[PDB]
């Protein structure tokens, strides 16, 4: 199956101001599917630290999928999208749109996420919103096409 | 309460051929909300004139929200998106998507709006389509998340 | 009435005889509308070559609409979007979203297309997926606003009905 890395980006969480329960929601969404959580890391809202982990998991570990959560809001410090985009060879806008739950009749707060989606080498990277609820709904939105997308990027089977 | 600037981009309106009724629709959508229109300007489809007002409102007048309308279409003269995007520190694609009313069973003409959304300093800027109908419907789409987005961008609290 | 060019992007189009069924699917969607297919060509998955055709069709031939199909997937060889973007004066993201069938809960996989949409000179260019089914669904999604879009880009009129 596909090896996943979960990167939580949060100033408050990194400095111990609050606990990360978002990775727990993400794990639940992945459980049952063709996924294996190979790594987990918590970093503050700092591009330098976000990238190090992204490069590490993509270039050294060769993870198939990287799911970051947090740092995609409109707050000045939220810079996960910018950090991620700097490392992508190409983007997959369709996945970014899915994560924003585009199409719902009731305007979703998910629309405020600036998260991007793209490929670095043979690793798919998705920026999920930071809240437990947000990350969950956004991940569930892409789940239906995630396996096939990963097969195309990595070249590995799942079904 | 958030201070709003309405910038109408229209060759005809600027020429004085037909008056601007779009700002009226915008004001009505915002009515009853934590909004106060503090500035109104009318310019033609000229990038320099558009940029001039956007810079004045964001950099010196300190407005919280700038709502431009017009010049986002596919006509050769429609250059509001370009003129605006070049002044943004970062974009909020999710709001641009909401303004295109993405997801309606019947393909919307709003899909033909190239308007962008983003932040410059502590000012949120959205490019709405130019007609009263166009601006009205696109603004209604983003209204539900507008106060929250502004609180994050401006730092000003909102209940 | 708008002059349309259909460009089928692939290397498989230069190798064992086969009928281009995607090309046919596209013609069917346009049938009846203010469209006349004035050009059709096959091109390999070589960006330089894709650009040469797009360049000529827009700059020299003056086509109103260019519908490319294929090479929009997540595979390292699918570079139709990159090749296209490099030739556009401006993009029309709304059309790219329509081609991905966003929010229609019609065909989930359509969301993986990286096809772009934009204008070069007075030519509207859209990158449709490569399969007959994919190209068909993406084109039908934009069809309702395609004539209006072309009238603005080209400055040419069209009849309704």
What is the SS3 string spanning chain C?
CEEEEEEEECCHHHCCCCCCHHHHHHHHHHCCCCEEEEEEEEECCCHHHHHHHHHHHHHHCCCCEEEEECCCCCCCCCCHHHHHHCCCCEECHHHHHHHCCCCCCCCHHHHHCCCCEEEECCEEEEEECCCHHHHHHHHHHHHHHHHHHHHHHHCCCCCCC
Task: Tell me the CATH number at C91.
Answer: 3.40.980.10
Chain-chain contact of A97 with C97 (C-beta, under 8 angstroms)? yes
The domain in which residue C151 lies consists of 1-161
Q: Residue A155 corresponds to which tokens in the numbers above?
A: 């070249």
Experimental structure resolution, Å? 1.6
**Phi and psi torsions of C53, nearest 5°:** -70, -45
**Phi and psi torsions of A16, nearest 5°:** 75, 15
**B120, containing H or E segment:** strand B117-120
> Using what technique was this structure determined?
X-ray
Chain B residues close to C97, C-beta within 8 Å: 97, 100, 102, 111
CB distance B66 to B124 below 8 Å? yes
List chain B gaps (C–N > 2.5 A) by preceding residue: none
Chain-chain contact of B96 with C97 (C-beta, under 8 angstroms)? no
**C-alpha of C95 from chain center:** 11
Q: How far is CA B11 from CA B25, B27, B37, B129, in A?
A: 19, 21, 23, 14
For chains A and B, count residue pairs whose Cβ atoms are closer than 8 Å.
53
Q: How many domains is chain C built from? A: 1
**A43, containing H or E segment:** strand A35-43
* Length of chain C, in residues: 161
B135/B22 Cα distance (integer angstroms)? 7
Using CA coordinates, name the residue in chain C closest to A145.
Answer: C109
Q: Residue C23 corresponds to which tokens in the numbers above?
A: 């090309």
* Chains adjacent to A (≥3 CB pairs closer than 8 angstroms): B, C
A3 forms beta bridges with: A36
B97/B83 Cα distance (integer angstroms)? 19
Name the residue facing B94 among A75, A106, A113 (closest C-beta).
A113
Angle between helices C132-142 and C21-30 (to 10 degrees): 20
Tell me how many degrees the CA angle A146-C100-C8 measures, rounded to the nearest 5. 105
Q: Residue A4 corresponds to which tokens in the numbers above?
A: 């996943």
Q: How far is CA C131 from CA B44, C68, C71, C98, C126, in A?
A: 44, 12, 10, 17, 15
Residue closest to B68 by CA, chosen among B93, B91, B99: B99
Mutate to test the interface with C, among A94, A95, A121 (most CBs of C within 10 A): A94
Name the residue facing B102 among C102, C149, C152 (closest C-beta).
C102
Chain-chain contact of C102 with A104 (C-beta, under 8 angstroms)? no
Least Cα separation, residue C121 to chain A (angstroms): 25
Least Cα separation, residue C52 to chain B (angstroms): 24
Least Cα separation, residue B128 to chain C (angstroms): 14
B58/B56 Cα distance (integer angstroms)? 6
Tell me how many degrees the CA angle C72-A102-B22 measures, rounded to the nearest 5. 110
Tell me how many degrees the CA angle C67-C36-C13 measures, rounded to the nearest 5. 45
Chain C residues close to A119, C-beta within 8 Å: 74
């Amino acid at each position: 199956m596909f090896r996943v890395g979960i990167l939580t980006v949060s100033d408050k969480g990194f400095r111990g101001e609050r606990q990360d329960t978002t990775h727990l929601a993400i794990r639940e969404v992945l459980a049952g599917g063709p996924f294996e959580v190979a790594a987990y890391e918590l970093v503050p809202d700092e591009p330098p630290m976000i990238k190090k982990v992204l490069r590490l998991w993509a270039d050294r570990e060769g993870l198939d999928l990287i799911l970051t959560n947090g740092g995609t809001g409109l707050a000045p410090r939220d810079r996960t999208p910018e950090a991620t985009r700097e490392l992508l060879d190409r983007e997959v806008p369709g996945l970014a749109e899915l994560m924003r739950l585009v199409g719902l009749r009731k305007t979703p707060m998910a629309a405020l996420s600036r998260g991007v989606a793209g490929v670095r080498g043979r690793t798919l990277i998705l920026n999920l919103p930071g809240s437990p609820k947000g990350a969950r709904e956004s991940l569930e939105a892409v789940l239906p096409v995630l396996p096939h997308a990963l097969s195309l990027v990595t070249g590995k089977p799942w079904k």
